[PDB]
CSV table of C-alpha atoms and ligand atoms in Angstrom, one decimal:
chain,number,residue,atom,x,y,z
A,1,UNK,CA,-0.2,0.1,0.1
A,2,UNK,CA,2.2,2.8,-1.2
A,3,UNK,CA,1.4,6.3,0.3
A,4,UNK,CA,2.5,8.9,-1.8
A,5,UNK,CA,-0.3,10.6,-3.9
A,6,UNK,CA,-0.3,9.4,-7.4
A,7,UNK,CA,0.4,12.9,-9.2
A,8,UNK,CA,1.0,16.3,-7.7
A,9,UNK,CA,-2.2,18.4,-7.9
A,10,UNK,CA,-3.2,20.6,-10.5
A,11,UNK,CA,-5.7,23.7,-9.9
A,12,UNK,CA,-8.3,25.6,-11.9
A,13,UNK,CA,-10.8,28.2,-10.9
A,14,UNK,CA,-14.1,27.3,-11.1
A,15,UNK,CA,-17.1,29.7,-10.3
A,16,UNK,CA,-14.9,31.5,-7.8
A,17,UNK,CA,-12.9,28.6,-5.9
A,18,UNK,CA,-9.5,27.1,-6.9
A,19,UNK,CA,-10.4,23.1,-7.8
A,20,UNK,CA,-7.5,20.6,-7.0
A,21,UNK,CA,-7.2,17.5,-9.6
A,22,UNK,CA,-4.5,14.8,-10.7
A,23,UNK,CA,-4.4,14.7,-14.7
A,24,UNK,CA,-1.9,12.0,-16.1
A,25,UNK,CA,-1.2,10.2,-19.2
A,26,UNK,CA,-3.3,10.7,-22.8
A,27,UNK,CA,-5.5,9.5,-24.4
A,28,UNK,CA,-9.6,8.9,-23.9
A,29,UNK,CA,-10.0,10.1,-20.2
A,30,UNK,CA,-10.3,7.6,-17.5
A,31,UNK,CA,-12.2,9.6,-14.6
A,32,UNK,CA,-11.9,8.4,-10.7
A,33,UNK,CA,-14.5,10.1,-8.2
A,34,UNK,CA,-14.3,9.9,-4.9
A,35,UNK,CA,-16.6,10.6,-2.1
A,36,UNK,CA,-17.1,11.2,1.7
A,37,UNK,CA,-14.7,12.1,3.5
A,38,UNK,CA,-12.2,11.1,1.0
A,39,UNK,CA,-10.2,12.7,-1.9
A,40,UNK,CA,-8.4,11.6,-5.4
A,41,UNK,CA,-5.8,10.6,-2.4
A,42,UNK,CA,-8.1,7.3,-2.4
A,43,UNK,CA,-7.2,5.9,-5.6
A,44,UNK,CA,-3.4,6.2,-5.3
A,45,UNK,CA,-3.2,2.2,-5.6
A,46,UNK,CA,-5.2,1.7,-8.2
A,47,UNK,CA,-4.5,4.5,-10.7
A,48,UNK,CA,-1.0,2.7,-11.8
A,49,UNK,CA,-2.9,-0.3,-13.1
A,50,UNK,CA,-4.4,2.0,-15.8
A,51,UNK,CA,-1.2,3.6,-17.0
A,52,UNK,CA,-1.1,3.4,-20.8
A,53,UNK,CA,-4.8,3.1,-21.3
A,54,UNK,CA,-5.8,6.7,-21.0
A,55,UNK,CA,-5.6,9.8,-19.6
A,56,UNK,CA,-6.0,9.3,-16.0
A,57,UNK,CA,-8.0,12.1,-13.8
A,58,UNK,CA,-9.0,12.4,-10.3
A,59,UNK,CA,-10.8,15.4,-8.8
A,60,UNK,CA,-11.3,16.6,-5.5
A,61,UNK,CA,-14.7,17.8,-4.7
A,62,UNK,CA,-15.4,21.1,-3.1
A,63,UNK,CA,-14.2,21.6,0.1
A,64,UNK,CA,-12.5,18.2,0.0
A,65,UNK,CA,-9.0,17.1,-0.6
A,66,UNK,CA,-6.7,20.1,-2.1
A,67,UNK,CA,-9.9,22.2,-3.4
A,68,UNK,CA,-10.9,25.5,-1.8
A,69,UNK,CA,-13.4,25.7,1.0
A,70,UNK,CA,-16.5,27.1,0.5
A,71,UNK,CA,-17.0,30.7,2.6
A,72,UNK,CA,-18.9,31.4,4.4
A,73,UNK,CA,-19.6,27.8,5.1
A,74,UNK,CA,-22.6,26.6,6.9
A,75,UNK,CA,-25.5,24.1,6.6
A,76,UNK,CA,-26.9,25.3,3.4
A,77,UNK,CA,-23.5,24.8,1.9
A,78,UNK,CA,-22.5,21.6,0.2
A,79,UNK,CA,-25.4,20.1,-0.9
A,80,UNK,CA,-25.6,17.8,-3.5
A,81,UNK,CA,-26.5,20.1,-6.0
A,82,UNK,CA,-23.7,22.4,-5.1
A,83,UNK,CA,-21.3,19.9,-5.2
A,84,UNK,CA,-22.6,18.9,-8.7
A,85,UNK,CA,-22.3,22.5,-9.7
A,86,UNK,CA,-18.5,22.7,-9.2
A,87,UNK,CA,-17.5,19.1,-10.4
A,88,UNK,CA,-19.5,19.2,-13.5
A,89,UNK,CA,-18.0,22.8,-14.0
A,90,UNK,CA,-14.8,21.2,-13.6
A,91,UNK,CA,-15.2,18.2,-15.4
A,92,UNK,CA,-16.3,20.5,-18.1
A,93,UNK,CA,-13.4,22.7,-18.1
A,94,UNK,CA,-10.7,19.8,-18.4
A,95,UNK,CA,-11.7,18.5,-21.8
A,96,UNK,CA,-12.4,15.3,-21.3
A,97,UNK,CA,-13.6,14.2,-24.4
A,98,UNK,CA,-16.5,11.6,-25.6
A,99,UNK,CA,-14.7,8.5,-24.5
A,100,UNK,CA,-14.9,8.7,-20.8
A,101,UNK,CA,-14.7,5.3,-18.5
A,102,UNK,CA,-15.8,6.7,-15.1
A,103,UNK,CA,-14.6,4.5,-12.0
A,104,UNK,CA,-16.8,5.8,-8.9
A,105,UNK,CA,-17.3,5.5,-5.3
A,106,UNK,CA,-19.8,6.2,-2.3
A,107,UNK,CA,-21.0,10.3,-3.6
A,108,UNK,CA,-18.7,9.6,-6.2
A,109,UNK,CA,-21.0,7.3,-7.7
A,110,UNK,CA,-24.2,9.6,-7.3
A,111,UNK,CA,-22.5,12.4,-9.0
A,112,UNK,CA,-20.7,10.3,-12.0
A,113,UNK,CA,-23.8,8.5,-12.4
A,114,UNK,CA,-25.9,11.7,-12.7
A,115,UNK,CA,-22.9,12.8,-15.3
A,116,UNK,CA,-23.1,9.9,-17.4
A,117,UNK,CA,-27.1,9.7,-17.7
A,118,UNK,CA,-26.8,13.4,-19.0
A,119,UNK,CA,-24.1,12.9,-21.4
A,120,UNK,CA,-24.8,9.8,-22.3
A,121,UNK,CA,-23.2,9.7,-25.6
A,122,UNK,CA,-19.7,10.7,-24.2
A,123,UNK,CA,-19.3,7.6,-21.8
A,124,UNK,CA,-17.9,4.6,-22.6
A,125,UNK,CA,-17.9,2.7,-19.7
A,126,UNK,CA,-18.7,2.6,-15.7
A,127,UNK,CA,-16.8,1.1,-13.1
A,128,UNK,CA,-18.3,1.2,-9.6
A,129,UNK,CA,-18.1,0.0,-6.4
A,130,UNK,CA,-19.5,0.8,-2.7
A,131,UNK,CA,-22.0,3.0,-4.8
A,132,UNK,CA,-25.3,5.0,-4.5
A,133,UNK,CA,-27.7,2.8,-6.5
A,134,UNK,CA,-31.1,3.1,-5.0
A,135,UNK,CA,-33.0,5.1,-2.1
A,136,UNK,CA,-32.4,3.2,0.8
A,137,UNK,CA,-33.7,2.3,3.9
A,138,UNK,CA,-32.1,2.1,7.3
A,139,UNK,CA,-32.4,-1.5,6.8
A,140,UNK,CA,-30.1,-1.5,4.2
A,141,UNK,CA,-27.4,0.7,6.2
A,142,UNK,CA,-24.9,-1.3,7.6
A,143,UNK,CA,-26.0,-2.3,11.3
A,144,UNK,CA,-22.8,-0.9,12.7
A,145,UNK,CA,-22.9,2.5,11.7
A,146,UNK,CA,-26.6,3.3,12.0
A,147,UNK,CA,-26.6,5.4,14.9
A,148,UNK,CA,-23.8,7.5,13.9
A,149,UNK,CA,-25.4,8.5,10.6
A,150,UNK,CA,-28.9,9.5,12.1
A,151,UNK,CA,-26.8,11.6,14.5
A,152,UNK,CA,-25.4,13.0,11.4
A,153,UNK,CA,-28.8,13.4,10.6
A,154,UNK,CA,-29.8,15.8,13.4
A,155,UNK,CA,-28.7,18.9,15.2
A,156,UNK,CA,-26.0,16.3,17.0
A,157,UNK,CA,-24.2,16.5,13.4
A,158,UNK,CA,-22.6,19.6,13.9
A,159,UNK,CA,-20.7,18.9,17.4
A,160,UNK,CA,-20.0,15.3,15.7
A,161,UNK,CA,-18.5,16.6,12.4
A,162,UNK,CA,-17.0,20.1,12.8
A,163,UNK,CA,-15.9,19.8,16.6
A,164,UNK,CA,-14.9,15.9,16.8
A,165,UNK,CA,-14.4,15.3,13.2
A,166,UNK,CA,-16.5,12.1,13.5
A,167,UNK,CA,-16.5,11.1,10.0
A,168,UNK,CA,-12.6,11.2,9.2
A,169,UNK,CA,-11.5,9.7,12.9
A,170,UNK,CA,-14.0,6.9,13.3
A,171,UNK,CA,-16.5,6.4,10.1
A,172,UNK,CA,-13.5,6.0,7.8
A,173,UNK,CA,-11.2,3.5,9.3
A,174,UNK,CA,-14.1,1.7,10.9
A,175,UNK,CA,-15.1,0.7,7.5
A,176,UNK,CA,-11.4,-0.4,6.2
A,177,UNK,CA,-10.5,-4.0,7.3
A,178,UNK,CA,-6.7,-3.3,7.6
A,179,UNK,CA,-5.4,-0.6,9.6
A,180,UNK,CA,-4.0,2.6,7.7
A,181,UNK,CA,-0.5,3.5,8.5
A,182,UNK,CA,-0.4,7.0,10.4
A,183,UNK,CA,0.9,8.4,7.4
A,184,UNK,CA,-2.1,7.4,5.0
A,185,UNK,CA,-4.3,8.2,7.9
A,186,UNK,CA,-2.6,11.7,8.1
A,187,UNK,CA,-3.1,12.5,4.3
A,188,UNK,CA,-7.0,11.8,4.7
A,189,UNK,CA,-6.7,14.2,7.7
A,190,UNK,CA,-5.4,17.1,5.9
A,191,UNK,CA,-8.4,18.4,4.5
A,192,UNK,CA,-9.9,18.7,7.5
A,193,UNK,CA,-7.4,19.2,10.6
A,194,UNK,CA,-9.1,22.7,11.2
A,195,UNK,CA,-12.0,22.4,14.3
A,196,UNK,CA,-15.4,24.5,12.5
A,197,UNK,CA,-16.5,24.7,8.8
A,198,UNK,CA,-13.5,23.1,7.4
A,199,UNK,CA,-15.2,19.8,8.0
A,200,UNK,CA,-18.4,21.0,6.6
A,201,UNK,CA,-18.4,18.7,3.5
A,202,UNK,CA,-18.1,15.5,5.7
A,203,UNK,CA,-21.7,16.3,7.8
A,204,UNK,CA,-23.7,18.0,4.5
A,205,UNK,CA,-22.8,14.5,2.7
A,206,UNK,CA,-24.5,12.2,5.2
A,207,UNK,CA,-27.7,14.9,5.2
A,208,UNK,CA,-28.0,13.9,1.7
A,209,UNK,CA,-28.0,10.4,1.5
A,210,UNK,CA,-31.4,9.1,0.3
A,211,UNK,CA,-32.9,7.5,3.5
A,212,UNK,CA,-36.7,6.7,4.0
A,213,UNK,CA,-37.6,9.1,1.5
A,214,UNK,CA,-35.6,12.2,2.4
A,215,UNK,CA,-34.2,14.3,1.0
A,216,UNK,CA,-36.8,14.0,-1.4
A,217,UNK,CA,-34.8,15.7,-4.4
A,218,UNK,CA,-31.7,13.4,-4.0
A,219,UNK,CA,-34.2,10.3,-3.8
A,220,UNK,CA,-35.9,11.7,-7.1
A,221,UNK,CA,-32.5,12.0,-8.7
A,222,UNK,CA,-31.4,8.4,-7.6
A,223,UNK,CA,-34.6,7.2,-9.3
A,224,UNK,CA,-34.1,9.0,-12.3
A,225,UNK,CA,-30.5,7.9,-12.9
A,226,UNK,CA,-30.8,4.2,-11.5
A,227,UNK,CA,-33.9,3.6,-14.7
A,228,UNK,CA,-31.2,4.6,-16.9
A,229,UNK,CA,-28.7,2.4,-15.8
A,230,UNK,CA,-31.2,-0.7,-15.4
A,231,UNK,CA,-31.9,-0.4,-19.1
A,232,UNK,CA,-28.7,1.0,-20.9
A,233,UNK,CA,-26.5,-1.1,-23.1
A,234,UNK,CA,-23.7,1.0,-21.7
A,235,UNK,CA,-20.5,-1.6,-20.5
A,236,UNK,CA,-20.8,-1.9,-16.8
A,237,UNK,CA,-18.4,-3.2,-14.1
A,238,UNK,CA,-19.5,-3.7,-10.7
A,239,UNK,CA,-16.8,-4.3,-8.0
A,240,UNK,CA,-19.1,-6.0,-5.3
A,241,UNK,CA,-17.3,-6.2,-1.8
A,242,UNK,CA,-17.3,-8.9,1.0
A,243,UNK,CA,-18.8,-8.1,3.7
A,244,UNK,CA,-19.2,-4.7,1.9
A,245,UNK,CA,-21.5,-2.2,3.6
A,246,UNK,CA,-23.9,-0.3,1.1
A,247,UNK,CA,-24.0,-2.6,-1.4
A,248,UNK,CA,-25.1,-6.1,0.5
A,249,UNK,CA,-28.7,-7.6,0.8
A,250,UNK,CA,-31.0,-6.4,-1.6
A,251,UNK,CA,-29.3,-4.0,-3.0
A,252,UNK,CA,-26.6,-6.4,-4.4
A,253,UNK,CA,-29.4,-8.3,-5.8
A,254,UNK,CA,-30.6,-5.5,-7.4
A,255,UNK,CA,-27.2,-4.4,-8.7
A,256,UNK,CA,-26.8,-7.6,-9.9
A,257,UNK,CA,-29.8,-7.6,-12.5
A,258,UNK,CA,-28.4,-4.2,-14.6
A,259,UNK,CA,-27.4,-5.4,-18.0
A,260,UNK,CA,-24.2,-5.5,-19.7
A,261,UNK,CA,-22.3,-5.7,-16.6
A,262,UNK,CA,-19.3,-7.5,-15.6
A,263,UNK,CA,-18.9,-8.4,-11.7
A,264,UNK,CA,-15.8,-9.0,-9.5
A,265,UNK,CA,-15.7,-9.3,-5.9
A,266,UNK,CA,-12.9,-8.3,-3.3
A,267,UNK,CA,-12.6,-7.7,0.4
A,268,UNK,CA,-13.9,-4.7,2.0
A,269,UNK,CA,-16.2,-3.2,3.7
A,270,UNK,CA,-16.9,0.6,2.4
A,271,UNK,CA,-13.7,2.2,1.4
A,272,UNK,CA,-12.7,-0.8,-0.2
A,273,UNK,CA,-9.9,1.0,-2.2
A,274,UNK,CA,-8.0,0.8,0.8
A,275,UNK,CA,-8.1,-3.2,1.2
A,276,UNK,CA,-8.1,-4.6,-2.3
A,277,UNK,CA,-6.3,-1.9,-4.7
A,278,UNK,CA,-4.7,-4.3,-7.0
A,279,UNK,CA,-7.6,-6.3,-7.8
A,280,UNK,CA,-9.6,-3.3,-8.5
A,281,UNK,CA,-7.0,-2.1,-10.6
A,282,UNK,CA,-6.3,-5.1,-12.4
A,283,UNK,CA,-10.4,-5.6,-12.6
A,284,UNK,CA,-10.7,-2.0,-14.0
A,285,UNK,CA,-7.8,-2.5,-16.5
A,286,UNK,CA,-9.1,-5.7,-17.9
A,287,UNK,CA,-12.7,-3.9,-18.3
A,288,UNK,CA,-10.9,-0.8,-20.2
A,289,UNK,CA,-8.9,-3.1,-22.5
A,290,UNK,CA,-12.0,-5.2,-23.6
A,291,UNK,CA,-13.8,-1.8,-24.2
A,292,UNK,CA,-11.0,-0.7,-26.3
A,293,UNK,CA,-10.8,-4.0,-28.0
B,1,BR,BR1,-22.1,10.1,3.4
């Protein structure tokens, strides 16, 4: 498990904010998108497997990784919709072309599925793991973290995230099978070392999860993109995790009904990149070679 980032950050000003990304290599774009509470760093041991298969791009969501913080920050900031406005504008600016393979996790999957559904002609394939693929109930959510996520989705969320940094310090390591090295953990901590609003994105994200019908706008979004994913003949790569976290049980059965789909299974809970990067990397490379072939 390599500890260094895959590339050095590059920056573009988007809508009044500097956003950070990795962009290495040439050819058709392979775009990796992290979710909460991670950054492009999550992909550092996976991207090498895609060398020579395209232009490898991994963006840091607004407020996350090396991307700027929104200001003034507060409970109305970093909604799905605002994260989308910033990321979609970044992807537009980067001139990704029209043969994009998306490699998606967590909220990166909601964003990337939405983007593909809105740019169907530009997407060649989607690989996804531990993704948001359908509206949920708490029974779908890992038992071990129900209480913590209900707390985030309440007024207790502010002290949990902004004061105590619980998403970074507890949720992240609790959903990795191995133990991160201190150096790896401190790469995850970096964007969030300051108590207070720097940690807002880690709180806004759980508040957007589509659970028991709320928030309704996100439930609506997921229902729209999932209807496309059911029907589309776009090639898919489903990277299932064991035991997994958010794609388990009935949700896993549901994903397995999608057409034109390759499956792999690798060990992991939620942050599967930190347990099985070689296997994930190999599988994405085989998928992309097939799509080029
Ligand atoms: Br979340």
